[PDB]
Amino acid sequence: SKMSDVKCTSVVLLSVLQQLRVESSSKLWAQCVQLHNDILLAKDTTEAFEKMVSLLSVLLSMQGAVDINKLCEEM
Amino acid sequence: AVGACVLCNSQTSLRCGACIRRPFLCCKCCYDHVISTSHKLVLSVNPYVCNAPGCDVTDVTQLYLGGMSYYCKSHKPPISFPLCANGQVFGLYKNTCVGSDNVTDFNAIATCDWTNAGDYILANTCTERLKLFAAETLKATEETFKLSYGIATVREVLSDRELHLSWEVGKPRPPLNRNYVFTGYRVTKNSKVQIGEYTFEKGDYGDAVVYRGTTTYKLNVGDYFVLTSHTVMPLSAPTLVPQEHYVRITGLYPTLNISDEFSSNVANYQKVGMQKYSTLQGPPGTGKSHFAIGLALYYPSARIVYTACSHAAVDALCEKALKYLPIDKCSRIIPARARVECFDKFKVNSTLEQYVFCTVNALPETTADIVVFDEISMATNYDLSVVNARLRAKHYVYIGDPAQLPAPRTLLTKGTLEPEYFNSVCRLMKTIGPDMFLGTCRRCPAEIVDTVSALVYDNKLKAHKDKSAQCFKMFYKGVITHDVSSAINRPQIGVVREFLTRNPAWRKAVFISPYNSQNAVASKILGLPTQTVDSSQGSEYDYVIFTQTTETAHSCNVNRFNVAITRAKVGILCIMSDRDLYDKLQFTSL
Amino acid sequence: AVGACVLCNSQTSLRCGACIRRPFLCCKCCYDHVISTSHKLVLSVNPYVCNAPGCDVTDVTQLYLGGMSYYCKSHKPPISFPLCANGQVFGLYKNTCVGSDNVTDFNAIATCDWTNAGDYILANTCTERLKLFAAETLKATEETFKLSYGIATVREVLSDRELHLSWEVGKPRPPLNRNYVFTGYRVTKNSKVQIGEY
Amino acid sequence: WDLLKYDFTEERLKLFDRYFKYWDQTYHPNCVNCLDDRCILHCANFNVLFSTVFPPTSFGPLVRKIFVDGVPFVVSTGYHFRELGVVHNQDVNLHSSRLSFKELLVYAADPAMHAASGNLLLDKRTTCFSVAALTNNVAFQTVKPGNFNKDFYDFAVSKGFFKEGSSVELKHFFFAQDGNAAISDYDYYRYNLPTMCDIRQLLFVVEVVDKYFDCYDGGCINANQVIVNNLDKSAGFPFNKWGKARLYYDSMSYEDQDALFAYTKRNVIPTITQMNLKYAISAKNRARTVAGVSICSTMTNRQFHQKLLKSIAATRGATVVIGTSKFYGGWHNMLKTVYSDVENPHLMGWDYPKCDRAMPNMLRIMASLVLARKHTTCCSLSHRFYRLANECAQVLSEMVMCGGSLYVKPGGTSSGDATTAYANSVFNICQAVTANVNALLSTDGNKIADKYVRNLQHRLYECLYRNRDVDTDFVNEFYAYLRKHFSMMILSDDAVVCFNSTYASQGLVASIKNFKSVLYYQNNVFMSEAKCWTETDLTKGPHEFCSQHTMLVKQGDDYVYLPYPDPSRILGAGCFVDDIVKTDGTLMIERFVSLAIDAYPLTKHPNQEYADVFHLYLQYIRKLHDELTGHMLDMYSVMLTNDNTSRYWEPEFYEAMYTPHT
Amino acid sequence: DRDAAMQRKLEKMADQAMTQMYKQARSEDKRAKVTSAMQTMLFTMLRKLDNDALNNIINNARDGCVPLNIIPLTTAAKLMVVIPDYNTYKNTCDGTTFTYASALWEIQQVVDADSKIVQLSEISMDNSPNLAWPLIVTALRA
Amino acid sequence: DRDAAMQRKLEKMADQAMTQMYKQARSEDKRAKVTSAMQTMLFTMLRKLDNDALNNIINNARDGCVPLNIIPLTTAAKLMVVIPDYNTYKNTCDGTTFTYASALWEIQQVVDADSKIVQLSEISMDNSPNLAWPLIVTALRA
Ligand SMILES: Nc1ncnc2c1ncn2[C@@H]1O[C@H](COP(=O)(O)OP(=O)(O)O)[C@@H](O)[C@H]1O
Ligand SMILES: [Mg+2]
Ligand SMILES: [Zn+2]
Ligand SMILES: [Zn+2]
Ligand SMILES: [Zn+2]
Ligand SMILES: [Zn+2]
Ligand SMILES: [Zn+2]
Ligand SMILES: [Zn+2]
């Protein structure tokens, strides 16, 4: 059940991005929404994972939003 | 609503009633706090008053829960049980609570009045959560007692949309803030009880205020609004983030051949890099305030947030950064109040720059790479908690010297506080010693630093300068005009005026005096820039004009003389009243 | 609507319809005023009149609240109750009404027609809140009595410096001074508009 | 043309006399002069062509400067419909002093004031005419993604769902949209071309469609008989700034509601309608938009239509199945009234691509006129024409506010007016009857062996193109023919037909190709045959009606049709909620109870992975109740005294929801 | 029990009437507030009208009626062009002045989808990707 | 039974109050902490996936090697990633190749915090301290 798991991780990731006020930068929210809708409408798991990587790169790029160290240590 | 117990952090719903800050409490902890102290009122999701049509019995040891209401002993129903039973006060999460033995200190923290000098020492050696609660309640008590208000009462109720106002003549009035609450005090004799918390914002026409209330009772003729509580923002972050030692510099990228002046502190910059939070202790004018700038120049790629409690320290840091750091890629933050003049040379109110400067109370909810907290001697636990809550930074640097004047603590009027109880960082420095140390005067002449190297420091402070012989010690009695409860010395300022014409090199000096009224009136008499001892900490001044006004306990304390005199880069003129202080200083006899 | 009682500033939604300005009254004050003097008409958010298909009763003390309407004794449903009872008149905020024994001077200020000098001298002794209503009802009575005057009209084109007047006979002629203006009316084949004031 | 020119009566008459010179019927360019509702259709069908040679800036409300207590208002005192020509208000007050609530409401609803006050706009994102921009900066509206319900997904994957290669896989998600969602979706009105429907055939399809609506009764009702379903729903623009619909249904008494309604029966009230983005679970990423109509329009349209509209929703066994539930043996009753004795049944279902954005103006007017044939007594004829003009001015082609900007709606039904399901039902029956007429006429005629149907075709052509007055005998005969060989079941755009197969193969009744042709030349959309289904075996019901597949199960001693949904839909409704407080679970057990009620029929499905969804929901409800009792026994020391949730995780409670008794 | 149990229904009826009366009083207080809001909105729009040009165009009309769709087109003093891509910009509002609706508009401002000002020199063929389209250009009649 | 009816009415009111209080408390709790809960849930799921590319980029972002722009998917697209250390440079950069996101990128341009273009030759253990970290690597997919 890995294809039906990237499709949920993408939803959670886009919710996280929308809670960091990426919605306020249209040029970036457009790409994020495109990647989200493309992951959801995917068949081959490789494409879904590649778009997942590209979408998570949005969250990792902004440093002052999340605290990756604290969130990753706990898990 | 539910919360977490202050002293055990378990889920609960029982606030206490007579504590100033309206805390949350556990079940067993609430039983122990109300059974041992004078605080009896308890607030669950609904208050624990009696439910008779007329009755006021709030002692939770008495009331009984019947049906779905609370009744006193007299109005008790047949089938019910008392609240205060089996060592607990009835509330939510009854049997998933773990108590703690820290109620011995919590009782004292919530009971005291913050006027003695034992209360403050208790509020600096308890657990972290108790430290935070004590600081919060201390701030609330200060805002209630000091400069509190004039008793206001509504003459008539025009409407619930806008109230009427009448301030009592003789006392001042505090302005609107939803954080302010004016308790209802209809004190005639009929139910002298809080009838709600209210805040008042006046309109632009006539005498009317569009109030915002918290209760559902119309204002009575005799009802008054008395400022007996202020709601400080509840703080969460600990006073000091836990220490963690590293083995290499992480998140900070050192330079090579930084400069010539800061070459001596290379090892100290490494020490800052290798620890989470570091503390630098240095006697006055020994080089802390440029050590921050040298830290900046040793980690050029690291975003830095300089912060301080007052506005003078941040301004001195701004001076030195503009003198050393690239002026373009800096900034300076000013609050929405914009009450006080600031340092307008960087791009103001630009948070995203690599070098921010700010006051602790106006910091934005952001991150950083290192936050330099300057002059912690003026920092209460509240300020440390605020800076820890607002600024998430890889490295902290607390620079300051406890020997200089502490925070106001207006309520404190009995006893005396040792340096090591001003706040948590001062306790860390004076208990286990500072992580960095640099004692060698670099600002004021060798004469004055030699003077001060005995009063406060046991001649452990060295000087690398020349005695300019411009340190004049004068003995003028200076008749005192105790006008506004702040000593004003007309003869003293007149004598300064008559000897200010004799010294051509002292026309652009700075006036310092331990009394605000004297400082303010000195501006008109001779036109010099006046600055009180409290707000002059951090800045550097070439020629200083000091005037010790009265033989007292305020102006006569050694630390205030230290901070007042050590601000003279090249020379100072001091007028005096106390003979004992005249006995040990090494100045020119004039 | 809701407002403040004229003589105690208590929240209320009653209004004595019998008065000229229809002042607000609270349940206690309204009961006192409708039980003491001849005023027997009250207005809540809805008028206190018998809401029967055919009937005409307006006395509050002779009315009963039946179902979701008001009916008098003749045809009220078997369910209680009389609107006026317990020293009160049914209305809003019945649990916040504060009584006031100023119903006597209030009645004197309200029911009087301001003919004799007594009304004016007792109209200034009252409190400010009631004195304002006294002034308002004085002005309303003055305007109504002004409407009860003999109107005038220009006879024809007489002269630019002076005119001549014809009046509706049978009614008094108002005194003519700088403190007494009149508005022309244009009730011709077209409209009734005001062309000028003289 | 002169910019200020709005009256093109002479030009329309010149065009008619130049091209359709010998067309012998009368032609009133201004449809307000029409003799009846069969002369409004004719003249409007001519106008919808003659209005494509006139400037597009000339249509829309006709403003005029009036004075209220001496201050000058600019208010709309008429309209210039592309179809209905010039319409003038009969009650214009050039000099008013006081504005009551009615007049204030009217002058705040209409777009004249807002458009005149605001800036000029030039929107290159859309080809549709753009009127104005109210604010100084355009507003971009996005759509947030759904909130994942991790507890339920973990439970499902622990119950062996969502495995690779399963037949029940998530397909319904909450899709997000960028800031170009609202205006890139309003732009789909470009598919609404000006279509000139054939008139001698539309004026007969109208008669048959009206025969379909003969069982019902309707009329006008007083303001105190109108019942609003939910009063907290929005009130359109600009009324949404000051409150919901409750504020305006309370502030206005019944007297001043009847005043407004009777004002609309002799006046035109142009109105603005917002375009709101829909935040709901769907299987395709295109944004879904709904037209939020004002309250000044909905109040009066309710008072006008609601009697007929609630008589349609209270009749069982008719062609329009609205108000018929699928529970308590309702789906079986619908599917067995569809099979109303048709000789060689074959089930069929079509799909309208861009149904609400491609519907021609002529057919929306036709639907609005068929719904208004019930006012033969309550309303006069001018009252009915002005009500039709109000419907066209507020719904058909009116100003649309799409993110702080007024554009012009070219046409097509707005899907949020007071009559959207029923008007679209009338449309759907119209298209079905037109397909039947085309199929019957286009048949050769010498190959038709049944001598009755050959004469019926002969008389059908004669009654279309050789008669000017209705022939009610033949209309009844053709309607009986259709109900004997073309039984329909219509829900607002979704139709199931039980057509006779022999006739359809011969060509004597509509088939899929006939519907495709009819849609091509009366909707300007190509109905691909890959979305319309045909079922040759009635023992498994329609392939898909109302997004519910059908299956023949055994209940008690007999057999019944049960509707089961798409399992992916129910799973995606459980997993992806549209709020953060619906993710908690224990608060929302009624959510899962309703979802299990919907998903119960899957238990009787032959596919085990389909039948497992119901048991998944029951087990999750059991777990939710268990942990709810745990949490409420920790938050207190006493559990609920009477916890009657023990029946929601037993299949009997749901099993009783698909049994005919109640 | 003849008189009692009529009191319970008597008080029940009295409470029901009072609660309804409370509701009706609140209803007549919201009606006044919304009426005042509507009046203020209408009058504030009035103060925004460009009376000179509106009078000039309406006096030309025969009946005094003019189509609404032109009231802005011939009287609005400020024009906003929303542009989806660079080609449309170059084709519609190239330079600092352009011509629409048979008038001459001068571009006073240019903002992007984020409401961030965009200088007219930043809109180039090669700089197009770096801009957050669509671009809203605000111009004033000249 | 008269007394038991009142007992049951009080008990039912108590149950209603308990349920309503639970709903309110839990709803306010769930709304209060939504950002932290959502981020922790995100990373729980993101670890549960256990993909090579996601793990690589997350483990790099923990050390400070974060990308300055969205990782591109199309072949031969430009990626700008900050490299904070010589160990991070050594592990990912080999020769003129770059291992990132479980893919091989080709380095085009390495710049410093001084914004001065440096070459791959200067990046050596002995010479590493001289360079002004953190470097910025601009590379293309291969
Ligand atoms: N390495 C140095 N060599 C010479 N002068 C120095 C050096 N470091 C600092 N100073 C001087 O000493 C002063 C110290 O200022 P400051 O840091 O405010 O003192 P402190 O922090 O001890 O109160 C500065 O104004 C600076 O000009
Ligand atoms: Mg210093
Ligand atoms: Zn207490
Ligand atoms: Zn009591
Ligand atoms: Zn009266
Ligand atoms: Zn009163
Ligand atoms: Zn006609
Ligand atoms: Zn009608």
From Swiss-Prot, chains E, F:
Domain RdRp Nsp8 cofactor: 1-142
Compartments, record wording: Host cytoplasm, Host perinuclear region; Host cytoplasm; Host endoplasmic reticulum
Signal peptide from the UniProt entry: none
Taxonomy, superkingdom: Viruses
Function: Plays a role in viral RNA synthesis. Forms a hexadecamer with nsp7 (8 subunits of each) that may participate in viral replication by acting as a primase. Alternatively, may synthesize substantially longer products than oligonucleotide primers. Interacts with ribosome signal recognition particle RNA (SRP). Together with NSP9, suppress protein integration into the cell membrane, thereby disrupting host immune defenses.
Oligomer status and interactors: Interacts with nsp7, nsp13 and nsp12 to form the replication-transcription complex (RTC): nsp12, nsp7, two subunits of nsp8, and up to two subunits of nsp13. Eight copies of nsp7 and eight copies of nsp8 assemble to form a heterohexadecamer dsRNA-encircling ring structure.
Protein name per the record: Non-structural protein 8
